[PDB]
């Protein structure tokens, strides 16, 4: 189309959530999603979890999993309208222009240019470009043999290619100790403890989830990964990567050497901010991504949501969050504000990890932490105020955590706050 | 004190007035309310350190009129405003000023403010134009009341009247600060002192006046023009302590020197008035200070910020906060248009000038950047080989050319060719 009322750049989780929100408030809305990915909008968490533990031998083809069985696609293709039928169809709809990249953003003229030369004008635009997986400098300096045997896990194709590799090679090494590195380690370890193959995980931190959880909970997570058969090598920094006798040779800075067949690099995300140049949009030098206000707005007719959005939290300060529920929350918020809602980010996004624990706010191990265990609650503190909470094996209490974050009180005794999560007897308080 | 008003402007200074005139130009029936904590109607401040000191009329402290063409410091006569009680009723709307009232609470979700007297006003569109408060020295704050009562923070009409009275009563006045305000008060007090036989001292940490703005060469030239007015300029001076000794103020500098004086004028920078950010949940910029706003001067859906208090995004030059008169006019006007749906980004650069017997300036005029002066002369402020700031030294009617240079963003290969655009055809200086 040459003109569309609502334009969403990027065909991921934030864009879809915004599409459903625009349609929910403007039942006749005409929303066009422009996605460089050839696949329709889909969720990513199953690509490192449920899709690996399915009994169906056609999961790599069906892309279905159990929760209740469902697909990773947000809705079936029949629910979308054609991009050619979007400006004419009665009652509007949602169309997805797959295989097309917005390469230019003209803010003053409310216009975008696609990679094929097409030009589309909009009335209201959302940037939901997500991010690209970061690579290691050591791997970039290496040759094609190393780069071609290194996987950057993000898309459906990465799940299929890596799932295929796990059935062909004897050893796979995961670099990175965050969520993605840990979840792929457990997934490959289970598949490896049956076929007799090897799975290695190495990262610079002292333990898995070191940059998120306190030292004690980080060590416990590392032990749960080791119980799945994974060889976890903490305190590991990569110096070089090369090929030796057809095998990948990773020489660590501390001297150790790891021989493996394939590498999975899960070492963080880089926001996709290419459109900031042509659009004259500000990017945040501290957190990265597009700088937007509390309402996820960049300019009069441009919002930003998802991994790419650096927004202002009225209670916690400027942030950029890179997880699924936040893309849904911020995507929905942008869609409402694109229909005049003028709402600030207020309902905090959360995340969880079945090992299980829930989490909300500024979960950063660099902050002072106070863990209260009986099951436990970990308070992340800044200026004597609770800015982050982790509920360790405590369920149906996230609303309580939302109130604490929202109140912003300087509590005099966090053991009393623990009572709000039913933590009373045999209290073991930990500090870090 | 209306309970509801379409356009609410917080602060009654230069940015607020410019926005009111801009809102009225685009919405001929607009009803604009200015809430000002100062008891005076909107007025311009530059004359308080310049023309009002060099007036032959001995009643300038009462009339507040000066020659440039004679004019008042007030932006318009009081009759052009409408009463706050008649604002929601007057035909074709108008602009009302609620003087003597401070907005002490901002409720963004409810589009409501609370004044210091308990009054509550709801708005449809709001502009924050609170300006800033003069910074003080820690040495003066650590001192006692005897010192604090003999220290002047120059900004408002009352400060001009109070200091003008002091200049006629005391024998020695010390100015702390080498910026515009400190330098202009030095020349103004120096002329008054060369007639009464009094003393004027100016001390600052920089190597010369305007050290943080102009390159070393133009800074030293400015220091010589101030010294020629009778002022004792003491550069490289940092204040360690201030006390009273035999009824006289004793300023001990960190390097050992001691200055005895009767009164102090502290012009050591400005602190943006961002008190309303707490209750309003508004972001402030930790790097530049002030309210953080985007290229359109917008903070939230119905809230803009202009003037000295606004930290905005320049599409060409990056994030900035500018503290001068023309910028309050430019950003105030821009906010007024965007409050009437313009959606325009800051694009037309604000400028400033200084008559030194003069020069014009535009962009990032910061001496910490590399400079290339071509001398009449033009000084280019460079960043990544791109011209981000220009100072036209005794070159007039060429600011449009300077505006285009800033707008182009070229990485010029020879600034001597760009100098020809200002009719400079040769002493090239570097810093
Ligand atoms: C394997 C995996 C597992 C995860 N598991 C979890 C989990 O368990 N829990 C959790 O909370 N989070 C998880 N996450 C994170 C979560 O998936 C992300 O937060 C979420 O996908 C971000 O949504 P998004 O819309 O911001 O971006 P994306 O999903 O990356 O979508 C952006 C889309 O826009 C496209 N695009 C970019 N630039 C352009 C352009 N110029 N023109 C057109 N299209 C463009 C990109 O190609 C991409 O297709 C996981 C992520 C991965 C990769
Ligand atoms: C003595 C002097 C000389 C100057 N000379 C020059 C010059 O020659 N050239 C130049 O370019 N610039 C000059 N400047 C700078 C220029 O005057 C300022 O940049 C300009 O005043 C900024 O306008 P403003 O509206 O942003 O703020 P202000 O003029 O400070 O106006 C803000 C007003 O809002 C009021 N206010 C604050 N908070 C509240 C509240 N909560 N409720 C109600 N009211 C509130 C403040 O009291 C103040 O009255 C000079 C400044 C001074 C002080
Ligand atoms: N379980 C997760 C919670 C929060 N953020 C994540 C980011 C990436 C991956 Cl793979 C998993 C998570
Ligand atoms: N000439 C000036 C230019 C820019 N900013 C100023 C601030 C205060 C004073 Cl007194 C003068 C100026």
Swiss-Prot record, chain A:
Name the GO cellular-component terms: cytoplasm; cytosol; mitochondrial inner membrane; mitochondrial intermembrane space; mitochondrion; nucleus; perinuclear region of cytoplasm
Q: Which residues carry this modification: Phosphoserine?
A: 137, 161, 240
Substrates-to-products reaction catalysed: A + NADH + H(+) = AH2 + NAD(+)
One record GO biological process: cellular response to nitric oxide
Q: Please indicate if the UniProt record lists Ubl conjugation as a keyword.
A: yes
Q: Outcome of mutating residue 344 to L, per the record?
A: In DFNX5; uncertain significance
Result when mutating residue 131 to S: Found in patient with mitochondrial encephalomyopathy with moderate clinical severity and slow progressive course despite early onset as well as and cerebellar involvement; likely pathogenic; decreased protein level; strongly decreased redox potential; strongly decreased NADH oxidase activity; no effect on DNA-binding
Per UniProt, NAD(+) 1 binds at: 177-180, 205, 211, 268, 322-323, 352
* EC number annotated for this UniProt entry: 1.6.99.-
What main location does UniProt list?
mitochondrion
Its cofactor is: FAD
Record PTM N6-acetyllysine, positions in chain = 257, 406
Protein function: Functions both as NADH oxidoreductase and as regulator of apoptosis. In response to apoptotic stimuli, it is released from the mitochondrion intermembrane space into the cytosol and to the nucleus, where it functions as a proapoptotic factor in a caspase-independent pathway. Release into the cytoplasm is mediated upon binding to poly-ADP-ribose chains. The soluble form (AIFsol) found in the nucleus induces 'parthanatos' i.e. caspase-independent fragmentation of chromosomal DNA. Binds to DNA in a sequence-independent manner.
Give the linked disease: Combined oxidative phosphorylation deficiency 6: A mitochondrial disease resulting in a neurodegenerative disorder characterized by psychomotor delay, hypotonia, areflexia, muscle weakness and wasting. Some patients manifest prenatal ventriculomegaly and severe postnatal encephalomyopathy. Charcot-Marie-Tooth disease, X-linked recessive, 4, with or without cerebellar ataxia: A neuromuscular disorder characterized by progressive sensorimotor axonal neuropathy, distal sensory impairment, difficulty walking due to peripheral neuropathy and/or cerebellar ataxia, and deafness due to auditory neuropathy. Additional features include cognitive impairment, cerebellar atrophy, dysarthria, abnormal extraocular movements, tremor, dysmetria and spasticity. The age at onset ranges from infancy to young adulthood.
Q: What is this protein called?
A: Apoptosis-inducing factor 1, mitochondrial
From Swiss-Prot, chain B:
What is the reported tissue distribution? Expressed in all tested tissues. Detected in muscle and skin fibroblasts (at protein level). Expressed in osteoblasts (at protein level).
What segment(s) does the record annotate as region FAD-dependent oxidoreductase? 7-353
| Consequence when changing residue 113 to L | In COXPD6; reduced protein amount in muscle compared to controls; no effect on reduction with NADH; strongly decreased NADH oxidase activity; no effect on dimerization; no effect on DNA-binding
Record keywords: Acetylation, Apoptosis, Charcot-Marie-Tooth disease, Cytoplasm, Deafness, Disease variant, DNA-binding, Dwarfism, FAD, Flavoprotein, Intellectual disability, Isopeptide bond, Membrane, Mitochondrion, Mitochondrion inner membrane, NAD, Neurodegeneration, Neuropathy, Nucleus, Oxidoreductase, Phosphoprotein, Primary mitochondrial disease, Transit peptide, Ubl conjugation
A GO CC term attached to the entry = cytosol
Please describe the post-translational modifications of this protein.
Under normal conditions, a 54-residue N-terminal segment is first proteolytically removed during or just after translocation into the mitochondrial intermembrane space (IMS) by the mitochondrial processing peptidase (MPP) to form the inner-membrane-anchored mature form (AIFmit). During apoptosis, it is further proteolytically processed at amino-acid position 101 leading to the generation of the mature form, which is confined to the mitochondrial IMS in a soluble form (AIFsol). Ubiquitination by XIAP/BIRC4 does not lead to proteasomal degradation. Ubiquitination at Lys-125 by XIAP/BIRC4 blocks its ability to bind DNA and induce chromatin degradation, thereby inhibiting its ability to induce cell death.
Question: Which residues does the annotation say bind NAD(+) 1?
Answer: 178-181, 206, 212, 269, 323-324, 353
What's any GO biological process attached to this entry? response to toxic substance
Q: Which residues bind FAD?
A: 11-15, 37-38, 45, 50, 103, 155, 308, 324-325, 353
So which residues are the signal peptide here? Answer: none
Q: What does this protein do?
A: Functions both as NADH oxidoreductase and as regulator of apoptosis. In response to apoptotic stimuli, it is released from the mitochondrion intermembrane space into the cytosol and to the nucleus, where it functions as a proapoptotic factor in a caspase-independent pathway. Release into the cytoplasm is mediated upon binding to poly-ADP-ribose chains. The soluble form (AIFsol) found in the nucleus induces 'parthanatos' i.e. caspase-independent fragmentation of chromosomal DNA. Binds to DNA in a sequence-independent manner.
Instruction: From the Swiss-Prot or TrEMBL record, give the protein name.
Output: Apoptosis-inducing factor 1, mitochondrial
**Organism whose genome encodes this protein:** Homo sapiens (Human)
First and last residue shown, out of the full length, are 128 to 611 of 613
């Amino acid at each position: 189309p040459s003109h569309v009322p609502f334009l969403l750049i990027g065909g991921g989780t934030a864009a879809f959530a915004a599409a459903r929100s625009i349609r929910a408030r403007d039942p006749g809305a005409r929303v066009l999603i422009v996605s460089e990915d050839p696949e329709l909008p889909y969720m990513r968490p199953p690509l490192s979890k449920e899709l690996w533990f399915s009994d169906d031998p056609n999961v790599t083809k069906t892309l279905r999993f159990k929760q209740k069985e469902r697909s990773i696609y947000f809705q079936p293709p029949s629910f979308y309208v054609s991009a050619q039928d979007l400006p004419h169809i009665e009652n509007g709809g949602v169309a997805v222009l797959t295989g097309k990249k917005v390469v230019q953003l003209d803010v003053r003229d409310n216009m975008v240019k696609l990679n094929d030369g097409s030009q589309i004008t909009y009335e209201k635009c959302l940037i939901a470009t997500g991010g690209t997986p970061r690579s290691l400098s050591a791997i970039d300096r290496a040759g094609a043999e190393v780069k071609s045997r290194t996987t950057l896990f993000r898309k459906i194709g990465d799940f299929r290619s890596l799932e295929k590799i796990s059935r062909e090679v004897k050893s796979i090494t995961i670099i990175g100790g965050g969520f993605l590195g840990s979840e792929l380690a457990c997934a490959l370890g289970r598949k490896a403890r049956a076929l007799g193959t090897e799975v290695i995980q190495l990262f610079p931190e002292k333990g898995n989830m070191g940059k998120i959880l306190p030292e004690y909970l980080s060590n416990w997570t590392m032990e749960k990964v080791r119980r799945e058969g994974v060889k976890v090598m903490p305190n590991a920094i990569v110096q070089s990567v090369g090929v030796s006798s057809g095998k990948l040779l990773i020489k660590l800075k501390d001297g150790r050497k790891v021989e493996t067949d394939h590498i999975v690099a899960a070492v963080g995300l880089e926001p996709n901010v290419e459109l900031a140049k042509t659009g004259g949009l500000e990017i945040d030098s501290d957190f990265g991504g597009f700088r937007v206000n509390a309402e996820l707005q960049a300019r009069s007719n441009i919002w930003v949501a998802g991994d790419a959005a650096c927004f202002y939290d009225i209670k916690l300060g400027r942030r950029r969050v890179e997880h699924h529920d936040h893309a849904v929350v911020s995507g929905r918020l942008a869609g409402e504000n694109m229909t005049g809602a003028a709402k600030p980010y207020w309902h905090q996004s959360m995340f969880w990890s079945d090992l299980g624990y829930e989490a909300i706010g500024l979960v950063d191990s660099s902050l002072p932490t106070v863990g209260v265990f009986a099951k436990g609650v970990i308070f992340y503190l800044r200026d004597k105020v609770v800015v982050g909470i982790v509920l360790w094996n405590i369920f149906n209490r996230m609303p309580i955590a939302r109130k604490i974050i929202k109140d912003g009180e300087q509590h005099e005794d966090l053991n009393e706050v623990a009572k709000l999560f039913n933590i009373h007897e045999d209290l073991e308080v930990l500090f870090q």
